[model samples]
Target chain A: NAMDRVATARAYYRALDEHDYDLLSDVLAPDFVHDRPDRTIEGRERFVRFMREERPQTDTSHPIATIYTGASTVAVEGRLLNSDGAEITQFVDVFAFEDGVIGRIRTHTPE
Target chain B: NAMDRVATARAYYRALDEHDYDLLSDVLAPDFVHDRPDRTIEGRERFVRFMREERPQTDTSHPIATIYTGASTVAVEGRLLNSDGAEITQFVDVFAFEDGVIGRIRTHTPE
Candidate 1:
C-alpha cells in the first residue's frame, strides 16, 4: 500500500553504512529467501549478518547502479567500488513482493 | 567479436555528454526499436536529440546505478535527474544486438 521497495533498498545501504542491525527485522521480509546459493548463506538473517559483520571492513563504497521493477517484484544491480577503486559489481537481489512487503529476496555476486 | 555491448552503451552515453555525431553512424544499430510506446520519438535520431537538447538542461546529478548483461543484448534502467529537482527515472532501451555495432535503440521516461 506504499512505496517501500526503494525505502527498503535505502535502508539496506544505510544499514551497511552505519553497520546497524535494524535491517534484520525492519527491512527484510520475515520469509525473505536468499537466492545466491553459491555464496553459502542460508537465509535473510545470514545475509543481513554478512553485511553487518563482514562488509564494513572493506575500504570501499558500494552503490546501486539501477533498480528495475515489474509486477510487484524488483531487481537491483549493486555496483561495488573495490578497496583499490575498481568497480567490483554484483547483482544485489531480486525480490518477490507480497501484500505490500518483501516475500523473498535472492542476492548474487559476480563469479 | 568482443565485449562491445557494454562498450557500445558507454559510447552512446559518451555521445550524449560530448554532443558528438559520430554516434549516429557508428553506434546506433539500424533496426533498433523502442518499446516504450508512449514516448513520442520515432527513431534513434529523435531520441538522441532529446538527450542532447532536453536532458543536459536539467540541474541534477544524474548517473546510472546498475546494468544487467545478457546473451546477445542488454537492458538498462536509465535513472534520470529532473531539471527541477526530481528523480526523473525510466526503463531504458533494450537492444537486440546484431553484428559489432548497435542496430537500434529506444528510450523512455516515466509517466
Candidate 2:
C-alpha cells in the first residue's frame, strides 16, 4: 500500500512533465486543492486546465531527490528545471490522500 | 528505529521552542547543516549560536500537523507561531539523520 501511494505520487510528477491531462486527472480527486506559494488552485478540473493551457512554463520538469511517506500522506523533495535543464526552483510538495487519490497538495520553496 | 527518529525530530522542535541550547546540541550532529530560505548554517555549533543569539524571533513555537518518515529522513509539516499564538508562517522541515542525530535540515515556506 505504501509503495502504491509512492507510485501514485511519482505518476503525478510524470503526468505533469508529460502534460498528460487524463493521467493527472486520474491520480487526483475531483475536489483536489493545491496550495502553492503564488495562489491556491481549488479543483481538479481547474488545476488540469491551468496546467494544460494557462501555466507560464510548460517545459519544466520535476526531478525528485527524496520522497517521505506516512500512512496517509507523501512528501516529495524535488527541483524544477526548465527545458534547458537549468534549475528554476527547489520544491517540496506534501500530498494528502483521500481514498487512494490525491485530495490536497501543499507546496513549498526556499526564498 | 522510525519511532526513535520521530522522537528525536520532536525533541529538536521542543528544544527550539524552549531555547534549550544543550538539548538542541544533543539532538544535532557535530556537522549539522541547516538550509533555510535566508541562508545555510553549516555546523552544529554555529547553528546553535545563531538560534540562541541571532534569530529575529526567539519566542516562536512550531506546531506540527503531520510527519512523514522514510528510512533515514523525516519530513514535518507545521506552522511557526509567535508568543501571542499568531502564525508567522507555515513550514515544512525535512530532516536527514546521521548516527541517530539530525545531520541536516532543509526548511521551506510558501514563496
Candidate 3:
C-alpha cells in the first residue's frame, strides 16, 4: 500500500516533468485542487490546462529527496532542477488522496 | 520507532508552545539546526535562545494535521493558532534525526 502511494506520487512528478497531460489527469481526481504560493488552481481540467499551456518552466525536473507517506496523504521533499541539472528551488508538496487519486496538493517553499 | 519519532516531534512543538526550555533542549541534539524562511539557527544553544527570547510569537500553538515519519526523518503539517485560537499560518516542518534526537529541521510555508 505504501509502495502504491509512492509509485503514484512518483508518476505524478514524472507526468509533470514529461508534460504528459493524460498521465497527469490519470493520477489526479476530477476535482483536484492545487494550492501554491502565488495561486490556487481548482479542478483537474484546469490544472492540466495550466500545466500544459501556462506553466513557466516546462523543462524542469523534480528530484525527490524523500516521500513521507501517511494515511491518504503523501508529503514530498524535493528540488526543481533545470534542464542543465542546476538547482532551481527546494519545495515540499503535500498531497491528499481520494480513492487512490490525488485530490488536493499544497505546495510550500522556504523564503 | 515511528512512535518515538512522532513523540519527539510533538514534544518539540509542546516545548515551543509551553516555553519549556529543558524539554526543547532534550529533544534536540546539541548540533541541531533549524532552517527557516527568513533565517537559519545553527546549534541547539542558539536555537533554544531564539525560541525562548527572540521569537516574535511565543503565545502560539501548533495544531498538527499530520505527522509523516520516514526512516530517520519526520514531516509535520500544521497551523499556528493564537491564544484565541485564530489561524495564523500553515507550515510544514521536515525534521532529520540522528541518534534518536532531532538534528536538523527545514521549515516551509505557503506564501
Candidate 4:
C-alpha cells in the first residue's frame, strides 16, 4: 500500500524524464498545487504550463534514493544531476494525496 | 500508527536539545548506523560518541518544518538555528527502524 504511493510519486518523475505533461497530469489532481517557500503554483493547468512553458528546460535525471510513505503522503529524497555529474543537490519533495492522486506537492531546495 | 513513528523520531531531536546521550540511545538501536554522503558512523555507541565527542558542540535547535512517517521510516525537513535566532542551513534526515527503535539514520546536507 505504501509502496503504491511511492510508485505514483515516482510516476511524476517519469513524466518529467519523458517530457509527458499529459502523463504528469494523470498523477496530479485537477486541483493540484506546487508549493515552495516563496511561491505557490495553484491548479494543475498552471503547474503543467509552468513545467512545459515557463520552467527552464534541462535534461536532468531524477533518481529517488529514499521514499517515506504515510497514510496519504509520500516524502521522497530526490537527486537532480546533469548527465555530466558535475553539479548535484539533494532535494526533498513531500507529496500529499487526495483519493489516491497527488493533490499537492511541496518541494524544498537548499540555497 | 504512522504518527507514533514520528513521535519516536521527534524524541531524538528532544534528546539532542537536552544533550542526553542516554535518551538518544533509547531511540537508536544497538546496531544503529548514522550515514551521510561522505562518511558513516557504524553502531550506536560510535554514533553517540561522534555526536558527543567528535562533533563540534553548538547551541543549535532543530525546528522540523515537515515530517513524513511511513511504516518503519521517517523523513524530516529540519532547520537548524542557534539560540541567537540567526539562520542556519536546512537539513534532511531519514530514519529507518528495526524492531521498535531506529536502526539507521541517513542525513543530507547541501554543499
| Tens digit per residue, CA lDDT, model 3, A11-60 | 99999988788999999999998876567889999999989886675578
Model 3 residue B28 CA deviation in Å: 22
Residue by residue across B1-111, what tens digits does model 4's lDDT show? 556677888999998878889999999899998866567789999888888984466778888877754434566877889889676766677777887788987675532
Candidate 3 docking category? incorrect
Which one is best on lDDT?
2
Each candidate's DockQ: 0.06, 0.04, 0.04, 0.05
Those runs of model 2 whose alpha carbons end farther than 4 Å from true positions after fitting are: B1-111
Span of ten consecutive residues with least summed lDDT in model 3 chain A = A66-75
* Pairs clashing within candidate 2: none
Off by over 4 Å in 4: A1-111
C-alpha lDDT of all candidate models, in order: 0.57, 0.82, 0.80, 0.76
Give the per-residue Cα lDDT of candidate 2 at B109.
Answer: 63
- TM match of model 1 to true structure: 0.45
Question: On residues B1-111, what C-alpha lDDT tens digit does candidate 3 reach at each position?
Answer: 767888999999988888889999999999998876567789999889988776675568898876655434577878888889999887778777888899987776643
Q: Cα RMSD (Å) per model?
A: 9.1, 15.0, 15.5, 12.4
User: Candidate 4 local accuracy as lDDT?
Assistant: 0.76
- The weakest ten consecutive residues by lDDT in model 1 chain B span B33-42
- What total of clashing residue pairs does each candidate reach? 10, 0, 0, 0
Please name the candidate that would achieve the greatest TM-score relative to the true structure.
2
Worst 10 residues of 2 chain A by lDDT: A66-75
